[PDB]
Symmetry: D2
Subunit: 487 residues, 4 copies
């Protein structure tokens, strides 16, 4: 049941009224990325409040293409009340740790498709396609020969199955359509046609809306304001109105968590005018970059690469993309060069568009496997880790091993795999592991190729004949005078 | 061997120099729709001329997501020189008929994937997905149990394969990545970052660019002008520059064929302030609409529905979408409400987005199958016909009862046949199916067949005649003009009298 | 002595640092209108703070083209600290009453040019013209044959002079240039090039900047943000950067007083989707309008005309302009049709551009002179009252017949005076003239006086009572309440019954 | 009598129908500048055609704020049919030489107000101000003590009068309001509200519309297209619709003469990515520039300064303004920084806003007076010459020392006069003064005369020769070629060697 469009106008309701249309066991899809990006907060809030006050609705399933929240009690963490959620499928998990706590305690069924694949299966679902065939995730925990993307004991049902085409290895991910969507835009007209002029980006708002709509579901959309019918520029409209069933107006909608007023640099409308360890790793990771290369800097210790490039005066010489869609820009970015929808960005990543990718690691093993989705008994999920480390041309892992000077000190077989060293070699990709103290490469036979100066050399890694001390410049609090390799 | 990017700048070349980068046997993907929409004309012209002069390159494969050209010698027709093209996969075939001539004569390998599916497989190819699973096409010529999308005898290889998931039948369409793209935008910066502010629409420019790029191919993009680096609005940039390898600047780039200067109504930047058998059909088709319904703008005899709605004062009460991406608007539309990329539009169509679907028909058989992709010995191809007739809630076929110069006069509230068509369209068994009556009933759909003299509905026991035009004889003008006998409804009535009167009907649109 | 441009960049300072560049006896010009419109609040606040703390700078002269503030302690009230200002020339005095207090108590030299004339003289001063010649103000207190615009006893120097050209009388207003400007924009680039995309309007920001710049003065500009050199759209730039000497950035800059977030309907970027005595006057005033006429949004009892016209469904048949530049719109208005600079708006008014103008009155005398600039012991000033009442085609004064705790009921299609007002507004002779009955008649203008109980028209032999409210006695409620004897029109009629009925009047707007 | 607005809609007519509304002896004001900038060509064309065909209307007065045309038969040259025009006031005359021919031949009454003053008197007329007071033009041919701005024998009525304020001399220029306007914009809505998004600039379109409107006249506006009411951005609207009486829609409207399609760099929407005597002068002119200074380069031998500054690497370190309103930019110009209305630009100029100005000369006399409005028996007029040379801080005259097929070659770091000019330009006494040496010295301005072979500076005792070109002989090439004796500076020196070498100079811009 959904409210009728009186005189063709989309129903405008309060968040409280809107969430009362969600029935028991509905499948709820939540648009958004970290730190409030494109998040319909009033809808999440009103739902959490309704279950707190009435213990309804019951046993919902959640689909979260990416990780919402503040790595604490925001995002979808408020929906982690027992009996509200029974089932969850997310591209990233640690960003709303109250949800992943439940999965950890076997309280809910829990899957993790790669974030890229997951948004693709929503787009498939919009078109009533049963699933998608991808080699993304072969040889990692999402492979049914391993965990099948299941995150805990209680998760039984198979969603991913192995298939064959051209006598070759592919995964088939089942496409699940949601019943309910919490989406958001900046502005919409009286018929629901929506533009995103002040939003940080687009994510997969249109895909989510289509997937829900074509499932006979209810799309609920939060906006900051509404305008007169047919007055928005048709080339700015990202969501056609007939896809939207309920609009919630939040006049105090903020681009990000924190309630700062609209920033038009962030909107994209104007052009804006310490030698620690993180920086050292950042610094060294930049050595892997070249002119004309398309890269991606990951969530974590790598994030400082752009700043190092700016300092070394080579930032314009290459381009860094963001998995959620923004291309280029400086530190939400400003002065971006383009913004794609999230799904299309992953389309680009899957076919090996990235020349260089920079990823964090929680654990590494003797086979060159990398673990990030699970560490210390806690569920993080992948985010876009697998989308990016599967087919990218050069893969640069970054993190601490546990003149340099190691004050207070603290690389293992992995209980679960997020990146397969073996699959990477067979695809013929160059793999690095950059550390505070030493730098490895992966080979058929992990070759130590470099070690930190001021240091002394669960498994034994080969050793390079060229085994060297890392660039000295890397260790002075001055300008490295770095030069970006040619194209 | 794409040319290097001097200091980050995308190489700018003449169309002539750009096509010299096309080697023998390359797969060429051509962006564009009918009448010049988003067509990189100079790049087509440069390849056609290079072949005319040198007989190189040779044995190219062509992918055309939709039909380019003017139903004559424009579009990719200039590419139909013998030896240039050996293989072609197109969403529509009649728009560049010189190419469909080669297919007709078995000179080339020729496939017709449904247009929507086709552009989705290109998107799949960008992600290096092997193919897509879809039930779009089941029980029609694209089904391997029928023709498997092959258009002639010479076409042998199976690209479409029957598969099963969740106890359901689906088709697996192989995804093929191109090596070369002819794409287009209005403007790009010095690094290739491209906007479409004056383009009629977007189509699947980005998808093609990604598909070719990730296949190690060479993306060639025509633009009207180039601007300083990083001065375009990031939210207007549809194609990131690292996807583009060669830019061709054509200062005389036109929005459509014809050479007309830029029309900023067509651009989207400004708001703009005869009763014959075609209007007749359009009028009766509008009766199928309701308030709040989502329909498609039809190609052919259905194209008059918008104008009739405007005349009847109900145009604002429902929404018509164009297959290639535009949504709403009036007569290139102006005053559109949104423009989606073509692929997303078909995503929406395939999931049953349309409440009402309006399509032409060349032929209808006794099972209520419909044919448009082949007739009169010619290859027309699907366009989006299968993408839209597969899962729309109401499927409304529109056309005259006979073909071949049918002439009628509407006078005195009557239909008068002054010159009958030479060809029967309502035949016994379609040689080849574009739409399955059986599959529509299975999917629970509501099927109408509107003609100028009669209206039918598809039931389980076949076509029911439900309305007959005043002025027309049931036996001589209908039964005699069909190769099968339809069930005659006990509820058979005269077509609404207001339909045949040359004044506004005072039509009231049914409630949502 | 101004700060140097380092590397071609306009210096950016804090408000506190910026105002240290203001010497003793500088002439300071303050941009802005009521309730925070285009007000450089940080600069005013900083100047005020510096004086409070240090008792410098001293003996400034102030130019305020219009009235800033909230009729209380905001606007330039902070600048009324004894010793800071010695001299002020303002188009409006009541909006910052702490300053008007200083004038009333004879503590400063105080002048009132008509607001429109005032901004034209600043524009003259930019060009180094010594003054302007205008008939605006002839026959009023700004006429040197009365008060010469001087507001108190201590003000002596004649700024206004009577002159003659083509055998006609004109005023010559002396053009005075300021030394300092406090201006504002939404955004500027690194060289000071400034746009107004989120501002309520433009006022005379460019004119002020030019007048100060060409006087060797210091232009200080508050903005919300700054952007990269040469990245703003050239057609959006209202102030060339070389006119700006100091930029202050206030990222919390608010469109209006009250610190609300930017409202994009107010910016102009998006299109927005009880019968008391004030409504009665507004209703009767609406009868003076006709299709296609241009009027002015009035301030006071008139300002509900727009809302009455919307209730009656004729709001789109004519157009209301705001003296400060905005044209059209609804209740900062939204959905405006245009925004002119303020000086240009007044050029239009002065040449008789208004078909109809609506104005409040505090007092009317027997010659039909109207007084608003001073009354009840207080200095209010003119605003644009004189610029508008000087030459508009129809001049419609609106107000109640008596004042001070007047209470009326509109019941049973009647006016009932439950409590008569204390103060008679219709007096024998104005102490000071803001509008001249004599001059308007010389100019051939149609002058109305609309009260809740009576309507008059100015003729050669004085006010003619032309209409009287139902429910009111001629002798007791009108004649005994005026200090002169109006002529009774032989066609004396009841005011239209519909005015006093709490339902839509079915008013039909007269034809163009 | 204007045609009625139907339902509030501005009448749309053909140019032919539109000009039919012009009666005999109407005063016609024509918007536009050189080369088709903002020219309502269809309206000029249609008025010219009508007179040719009908010898009506008769005896029109013309006001042309600046010079329209191509120095031949375009612009208002088609209006030169004998008996159509009897009277003309223009800011520049040479641009439509068929009209200036009529004046030379004494067939019409003919005046030249300085271009800036002229546009300012139109603005004054909008406000019903009788005229303006300005010292712009004192001591020149526009000064009544000389020619009072009258260009021939038949012109007798005094429009300009000497006056006095504050013990200083000023000119009083009569403000004349036109009866008809030919204006132009890019786009307007159905009520006349007009945007200039693709126009080269704005000029004084609004001032013209207000002047004519407030004179009971008819405002005719050519546009490229029309749009639905109230859909234009209110901050983009430059002309309120109620000022426009007739619209003529020309879908083929072109930004400039020559019919090129719209150029969006010229619109302002996008950022665009030989050693001879003229380059020599431009180079020596550049020596006069300083960091952060505001200049204007004039049409003529100086116009190469921008390109030189780009070649030398200092183009971004100062700003050049165009008299008609555009600020900054490169070769119409693109990448502009701002565009002002023309009148405001001249306000800025009149108040001494220019640090440096570059102007051409046709003649110089022993007093350092300069002539350009008449020479060789032809009326050229002033353009902005007087507005710019009257008060700018530094005035740099640029030209050759002789005229009349002068041929020079620059070789071996020397100038070589290969064929000496026929005509001496440095003469004993100017027949008529465009710029006065005395007044400039009285105003304390720095005055330079740069030629290809010699540089002079103005002083109390006349011109000082301060620099001489290498390769040139003082006596034979300079003294023998002037009809007066200059002071030879004791500090006389060779002109910078670098000027004369066919490589970048390594010029470094001084900061004062």
């Amino acid at each position: 049941v959904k409210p009728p469009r009186i005189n063709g106008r989309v129903p405008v309701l309060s968040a409280q009224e809107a969430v009362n249309y969600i029935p028991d066991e509905a499948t709820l899809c939540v648009l958004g990325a970290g730190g409030g990006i494109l998040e319909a907060t009033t809808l999440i809030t009103a739902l959490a409040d309704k279950y707190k006050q009435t213990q309804t609705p019951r046993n919902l399933s959640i689909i979260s293409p990416t990780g919402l929240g503040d790595r604490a009690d925001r995002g979808i963490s408020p929906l982690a009340q027992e009996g509200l959620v029974k089932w969850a499928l997310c591209g990233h998990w640690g960003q709303s740790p109250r949800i992943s706590d439940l999965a950890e305690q076997n309280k809910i069924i829990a899957y993790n498709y790669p974030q890229g694949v997951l948004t693709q299966t929503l787009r498939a679902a919009a078109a009533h396609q049963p699933g998608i065939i991808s080699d993304i995730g072969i040889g990692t925990f999402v492979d049914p020969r391993q965990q099948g993307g299941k995150l805990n004991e209680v998760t039984k049902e198979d969603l991913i199955k192995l298939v064959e085409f051209d006598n070759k290895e592919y995964l088939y991910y089942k496409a699940i359509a949601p019943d309910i969507a919490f989406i958001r835009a900046t502005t919409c007209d009286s018929e629901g046609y929506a533009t995103f002029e002040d939003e940080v980006m687009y994510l997969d708002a249109l895909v989510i809306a289509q997937a829900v709509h074509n499932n006979g579901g209810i799309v609920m959309m939060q906006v900051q304001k509404m305008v007169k019918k047919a007055t928005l520029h048709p080339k700015s409209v990202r969501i056609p109105g007939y896809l939207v069933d309920i609009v919630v107006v939040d006049p105090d909608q903020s681009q990000l968590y924190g309630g700062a007023p609209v920033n038009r640099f962030i909107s994209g409308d104007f052009t804006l005018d310490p030698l620690n360890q993180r920086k050292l790793v950042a610094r060294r990771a930049l050595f892997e970059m070249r002119k004309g290369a398309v890269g991606n800097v990951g969530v974590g210790i790598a994030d400082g690469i752009g700043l190092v490039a700016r300092e070394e005066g080579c930032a314009d010489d290459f381009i860094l993309t963001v998995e959620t869609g923004p291309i280029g820009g400086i530190t939400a970015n400003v002065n971006t060069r383009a913004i794609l929808d999230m799904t299309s960005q992953f389309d680009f990543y899957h076919g090996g568009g990235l020349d260089v990718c920079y990823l964090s690691f929680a654990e590494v093993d003797q086979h060159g496997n990398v673990g990030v989705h699970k560490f210390n008994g806690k569920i993080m999920g992948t985010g876009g880790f697998i989308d990016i480390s599967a087919t990218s041309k050069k893969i640069i892992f970054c993190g601490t091993l546990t003149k340099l000077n190691i004050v207070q000190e603290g690389f293992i077989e992995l209980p679960e795999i997020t990146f397969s060293g073996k699959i990477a070699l067979e695809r013929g990709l160059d793999v690095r592991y950059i550390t505070e103290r030493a730098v490895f490469t992966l080979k058929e036979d992990l070759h130590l190729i470099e070690i930190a100066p001021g240091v002394d050399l669960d498994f034994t890694p080969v050793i390079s004949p060229e085994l060297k001390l890392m660039d000295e410049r890397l260790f002075i609090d001055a300008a490295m005078g770095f030069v970006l390799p040619e194209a």
